[PDB]
From a paper:
Mutations in the human [name] gene cause the neurodevelopmental [name] syndrome. Based on the crystal structures of [name] from Drosophila melanogaster (dmPURA), three conserved sequence regions termed [name] repeats I, II, and III were identified to fold into globular domains. Whereas [name] repeat I and II assemble into an N-terminal [name] domain via intramolecular interactions, two C-terminal [name] repeats III from different molecules interact with each other and thus mediate dimerization of [name]. All these [name] domains belong to the class of the PC4-like protein family, which mainly bind single-stranded nucleic acids and can unwind double-stranded DNA and RNA.
In contrast, the spectrum for hsPURA I–II [name] indicated a strongly altered secondary structure content. To understand how exactly the surface-exposed [name] mutation alters the domain folding of [name], we solved the crystal structure of hsPURA I–II [name]. The asymmetric unit of the crystal contained two molecules of hsPURA I–II [name] and showed good overall fold similarity to the hsPURA I–II structure. However, an overlay of both molecules of the [name]-variant protein from the asymmetric unit also revealed unusual differences between them with r.m.s.d. of 1.48 Å for 125 superimposed Cα atoms. More C-terminally, the loop linking β6 and β7 is shorter by two residues, thereby correcting again the sequence register within the next β-strands (β7 and β8). From all the areas of the structure, the β-ridge appears to be structurally the most divergent part. It is surprising that the [name] point mutation, which is located on the β4 strand of the β-ridge, induces the observed unusual change in the β-sheet arrangement without destroying the domain’s overall scaffold. Importantly, all the resonances perturbed upon [name] mutation remained in the presence of 1H-saturation, confirming that the structural rearrangement does not induce protein unfolding. Together, this shows that the [name] mutation does not induce global unfolding of hsPURA I–II, but rather triggers structural rearrangements mostly in the β-strand region. While hsPURA I–II quantitatively bound a 24-mer CGG-repeat RNA, the hsPURA I–II [name]-variant protein showed moderately but significantly decreased RNA binding. With an effect considerably stronger than observed for RNA binding, the hsPURA I–II [name] variant showed a loss of strand-separation activity by 90%.
Numbering used by the authors:
A (entry chain B): 55 to 133, 145 to 176, 179 to 210
B (entry chain A): 58 to 125, 141 to 212
The structure:
Amino acid sequence: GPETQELASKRVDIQNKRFYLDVKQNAKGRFLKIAEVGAGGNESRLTLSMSVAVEFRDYLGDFIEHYAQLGPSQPPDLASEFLVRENRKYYMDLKENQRGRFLRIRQTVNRGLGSTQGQTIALPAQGLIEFRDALAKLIDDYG
Amino acid sequence: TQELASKRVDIQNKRFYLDVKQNAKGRFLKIAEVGAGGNESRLTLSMSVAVEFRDYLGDFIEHYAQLGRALKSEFLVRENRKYYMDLKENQRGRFLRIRQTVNRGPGLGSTQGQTIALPAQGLIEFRDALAKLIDDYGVE
Ligand SMILES: [Mg+2]
């Protein structure tokens, strides 16, 4: 609320989706919040450390360079996986929905049968370069 | 396949060659660790993964530099490949181990694959060399 202050923000418009890339700050340090605004104003959030954001900028870079090769392999005629794990706990997954022309990104934490849920955005493939450019500009300026 | 550029980083008895190479598919980074009798271990990365690898090294360096949430292990599954990066400690020294395995098809599992082990003292030098070849020869 008044705990976290906002330092900077960028808006990117791709199809009917609006993304806000925010640089924010609290007691715990500086982080990057991505807000996606869908139909009916349904927001989904992705929240990144400044080091995971650097990584994420480059994962987007990888897909931009390699979008078809990293897409889902065609099925068998009648005759892909992109996952990052850190300290065996924190997961980030990126996967193309070919029907949507979307890149789905999920961040989760696993803790045996411990409980936890996580965070998911989907980026139209036609706004990948623009999203990534905006993300990169915020990293250049906000350490 | 053409050798565009190389750099050598010397860390204890080991030497690490970082080479940019070019072929059909695109540019890659060959890393090759040479021990005291010339035994080689080799790692080949696309430039995209080389860039990811640069970022992982910054994180290992933040952990190594800490006095007394910091990256201890990183795993990346990308296409038919897995990469395992483990900041290991023994009493003889701290080092970063990097294992590559590759999936050789359905039902075949994956190859044990070649391993490099980077003494922690040389992470910064190694990262600096990598970053310089990415700047001079990378795309992303
Ligand atoms: Mg993560």
